[model samples]
Target: MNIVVLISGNGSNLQAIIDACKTNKIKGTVRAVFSNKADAFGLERARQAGIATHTLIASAFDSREAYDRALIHEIDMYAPDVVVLAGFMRILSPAFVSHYAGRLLNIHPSLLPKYPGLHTHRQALENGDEEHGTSVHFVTDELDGGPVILQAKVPVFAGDSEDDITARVQTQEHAIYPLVISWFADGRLKMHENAAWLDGQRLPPQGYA
Candidate 1:
């Protein structure tokens, strides 16, 4: 399978995907890595792995749709079978989301439907929740609102700081994201009827743990 990863930060998750592909944990190759920030360290990681990298400044375009259109053109050049949002911070345009549709994936730092935007760890801690985790889902136009494909739960202990919870969730994210990609690569995972399906069965609302 051909894959294109999008990122805009440190990209530890991108490194995880690259390592998984190298170790044969993912049955696919990363065709390219794209970022909105040219100075993003993820670009260096991609270069070290000999993967093609591209960058587009969102400010250069006239509008969000215009930037997404150009992004679509650049991504299509690689002919990716899957598009991954590995730390991509931008809220994508509807046109871009529809163009990729079922093939686009994202890993959100929350259980989802609970904390869809930012500071997920802080939200969980503030609410005194016992369980917090990450969700890998199909990307839809809705912000972090998509069919969850998989989730990894982590216990939220008393007095846990945001960094502690974030670290735990990120570890799970690293593991599950590539696993989902593998399932998709092998045709065992799919998005159908606005929900996630795996191995011919529709996954539960929370997806597999």
Candidate 2:
């Protein structure tokens, strides 16, 4: 697979994917990484790994849509088979989502359908969910409402603080995000109509149970 990652911050997830590629755990070529923030460590990490990197500020364009259009256009120039949203902070436009619908992927910090946006750990705690984890899914035009490909779960301990739980779930994110992506790249996973299947078997990741 020819791959690109878009990120905004810490980019620990991006680093995992890159590590996977370097180790041949993810059987694909990571062609480039693009970031909306110029100071993103993700772009720096990509550059250090000898993978191409681009940091085009969304602020440079007149409108968000214009920025997204330019960003997508740049990504397409790489001819990537997959585009990964590692930790991209911007709210992408519907047009941008549709442009890479089937081929775009994202790893959410929460065991999604719960905390779809940020502050996921706090959301899970306030909502009284027994567990909080991470999800790897196909990106859609409908926010984080994409069809899931793989998930990893973790217990929300009775006395756990946000930092504690966050660390736990992020461990799962780092572990499975790359593994799940490897499945996609290696043909063990398939995406259709925004749904995913592993080796022709439909995935049923209904809950963290």
Candidate 3:
């Protein structure tokens, strides 16, 4: 499989994917890394790994749709089998979401259905949840409301600060994001009937935990 990753910032998750590809943990190649910001450290990470990188400043385009259309052109150049969103902060337009459809994937910081957008860690702490984690799901037009593929739960220990929980959930993110990508690469994962399926079994709403 050929893969393209989109990122906006530090991209620690991107680093995990790159490492997995190098170790043959994922049966694919990261064809390119695209960023909306030129200063994204993920671009540097891709370059260090000798992978191609592209940067498209979103502000250059007049509208969200226009920027996404240009992004599609850049991504299609590689003819990627899968497009991974690893810390890509931009909210994609519906057109962009539909273009990739089954092949688009994202890893959200929260367990999802619980917290969809920013400040997930703070939300978890404030809610006094006993468990906090990360979720990997298909990218739908709905923010983080896609069908979940996998989740990794971490205990919210007593006296744990927001940063503490965040670090813990991110550790799990690094572990599972590559595994889910490998499942897709190996032809064992699919988006069927608007849900996630693995090994011919339709995954439940919460997916594997």
Q: Per-residue CA lDDT of candidate 1, range 1-209, in tens? A: 99999999899999999999999888999999999998999999999999999999988889887888889999999999999999999988777888998999999998876798888888899999999999999987654467899989999888786776999999999999999999998899998877899998998888864
Name the runs in model 2 displaced over 4 angstroms: 142-144, 205-209
Using all chains and alpha carbons, the TM-scores for the candidates as numbered come to 0.96, 0.93, 0.96
By TM-score, highest first, what's the ranking?
3, 1, 2
Which residue pairs collide in model 1, if any?
none
Give the distance in Å from residue 191's predicted Cα in candidate 3 to where it truly belongs.
Answer: 0.5
Candidate 2, run of 10 with poorest lDDT: 200-209
Assess each prediction's global lDDT (C-alpha) against the native: 0.91, 0.83, 0.91
Q: Say what the RMSD of model 3 is.
A: 1.4
lDDT of 3 by residue, 44-106 (tens): 999999999999897788987788889999999999999999999898878888999999999
Counting clashing residue pairs in each candidate, in order, gives 0, 0, 0
Give the 10-residue window scoring lowest on summed lDDT in candidate 3.
138-147
